[PDB]
Design a protein around this ligand. Structure first.
Ligand SMILES: *C/C=C(C)/C=C/C=C(C)/C=C/C1=C(C)CCCC1(C)C
Ligand SMILES: *C/C=C(C)/C=C/C=C(C)/C=C/C1=C(C)CCCC1(C)C
Ligand SMILES: *C/C=C(C)/C=C/C=C(C)/C=C/C1=C(C)CCCC1(C)C
Lengths: 222, 222, 222
């Protein structure tokens, strides 16, 4: 299409599709109810991302938002994706370590706040206010990462995989606010095509990279 | 109103309203926590459908979608209905057989995908792409039916009612993609008034017919 | 801004922000998994309300709805707030008394119906029909209050705090339908600025007042 970022939307679509089919095949046969949990969550994440990447690819998950005196192309379908896939990723972490239910509700709710204020900021027409929504969203993000480091001694294989995915999680999640701030939704420093490439690389890593790590671990079996 | 399909929207409204009141009365008194679960789920389904049928009846759950060179009247409120009532129906099935939590998350999530890609397809303005969304949605549907047949030996009364509702479920759910494909959202083979009648007949059967079967079974008591 | 109700939107923003930070601080340290549950739920409620009050303050959570021959300013962000915070409040009540899961699903679902039909009524352009949606929503509300009084003998400290919050809940929740009926969404008897003040006073009391009561009780610890 006439959008230079199309190629990154098509590659992300393909890679999310392929990861989904891989995990679907892989979880074939699994009977341990525990492992079953991790397979369902982990397979669903790139399945949802597949649909939202394809809706961006086809033009559906795109809208124009007037601000700073211009019609800015905003991919809102990323927030419909993240709204469901980021809590699922947190649930994977939470289940690994057998979190208390209050801690899980804390994470899911802070996550909802994170993504929904990101979406409000994305669609806000007063330029300055976009960054107020960014800051609140970033603060929800920092609460989540705090809880992942200070809110949780289980068996050695659980701990190790959990420590690895936790570190993956802090590194990739932390890059999202930066990308948003310098890209088309924020300061407009980086063109939309580079921005879309960056989000594609983070999304595939946090979704398909993260799940490859988890699903190859025996940490997922009781 | 000026919409010939109005009569089917009014009959579905009435029938969903009546089923809701029936199940509400019927569940009056029930103390077995197990039965309580099935009564809550099963009563909520036509209560939600009542509201969405009435919003269609009154004109609120209707929007025009330009495609194939025309303004097509699309009843989007059916997807707001299904988004909540189809997982609830699956939960009824899942609870009957004491499914593992991973299997339940699999079903709910595939269901969300099913309905949300149905909704994207319903609102997509590029005619050809409508059917890509249809196919993905149908594939989520086929995953769900697969899990209902191969993803699950409990007491005889549980098994029997579960096998009956499962068969009801495959027969009616399978008709939805066909109706969509030949009706106003898809190939436009069947007029909207006939389409609305067909969805009304399926909806009442899958919602009020299904629940009459379940709630008369002693399978719902511990 | 040019909206006289701005001051009440700014005060509610501030008060919800402050309550959120207070409860966040207060729950610092808490290790009893039970108390942890109540702290997560109770902190999340004004955190969400903070964001929705601020989105109203900044103009984002406002839309114009044509009806009765005029462009009526409708604050739709209140329904995005309530959609999540009213079930959370009900969960606090439900957990106190160790409700059965079927009773909790009953409450959450009737609540969803309550808020979603409130939102449909808020955005309906046919004046008379606005009040049909009001009545259905009020009936869902009356079901919820019924279940809170007749749908539930635990330890004395649980019962007492539960009876107090239940009474707080019936008194404040019952005022919402009245405000809606006489304010800008309904009969237009009371100007939007007074209406917004009334909702601000109810919201802070039901959210921050209610949680102060709960979180000072030892009822929240196992
Ligand atoms: C499915 C992929 C994942 C793990 C994506 C995560 C996205 C984020 C952590 C988003 C965070 C943002 C903020 C903290 C600030 C404002 C904008 C966001 C939504 C990009
Ligand atoms: C409340 C009534 C029920 C059980 C309705 C079920 C609806 C479906 C199974 C819908 C399925 C569809 C697809 C598989 C393809 C595309 C369009 C849909 C959403 C009609
Ligand atoms: C976060 C604050 C709370 C507890 C707000 C509760 C709101 C209600 C109980 C709303 C009820 C309504 C109806 C019963 C009728 C129609 C309109 C509503 C949504 C205002």
């Amino acid at each position: 299409t006439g959008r230079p970022e199309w190629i990154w939307l098509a590659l992300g679509t393909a890679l999310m599709g392929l990861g989904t089919l891989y995990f679907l095949v892989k979880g074939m046969g699994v009977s341990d109810p525990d492992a079953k949990k991790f397979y369902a969550i982990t397979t669903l994440v790139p399945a949802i991302a597949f649909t939202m990447y394809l809706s961006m690819l086809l033009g559906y998950g795109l809208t124009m938002v007037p601000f700073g005196g211009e019609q800015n192309p905003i991919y809102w379908a990323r927030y419909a994706d993240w709204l469901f896939t980021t809590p699922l990723l947190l649930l994977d972490l939470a289940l690994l370590v057998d979190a208390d239910q209050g801690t899980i509700l804390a994470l899911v709710g802070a996550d909802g706040i994170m993504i929904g204020t990101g979406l409000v900021g994305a669609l806000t027409k007063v330029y300055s206010y976009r960054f107020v929504w960014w800051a609140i969203s970033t603060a929800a993000m920092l609460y989540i990462l705090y809880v992942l480091f200070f809110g949780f001694s289980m068996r050695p294989e659980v701990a190790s995989t959990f420590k690895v995915l936790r570190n993956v999680t802090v590194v990739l999640w932390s890059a999202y606010p930066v990308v948003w701030l310098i890209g088309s939704e924020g300061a407009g420093i980086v063109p939309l095509n580079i921005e879309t490439l960056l989000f594609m690389v983070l999304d595939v890593s946090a979704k398909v990279g993260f799940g490859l790590i988890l699903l190859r671990s025996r940490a997922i079996f009781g």
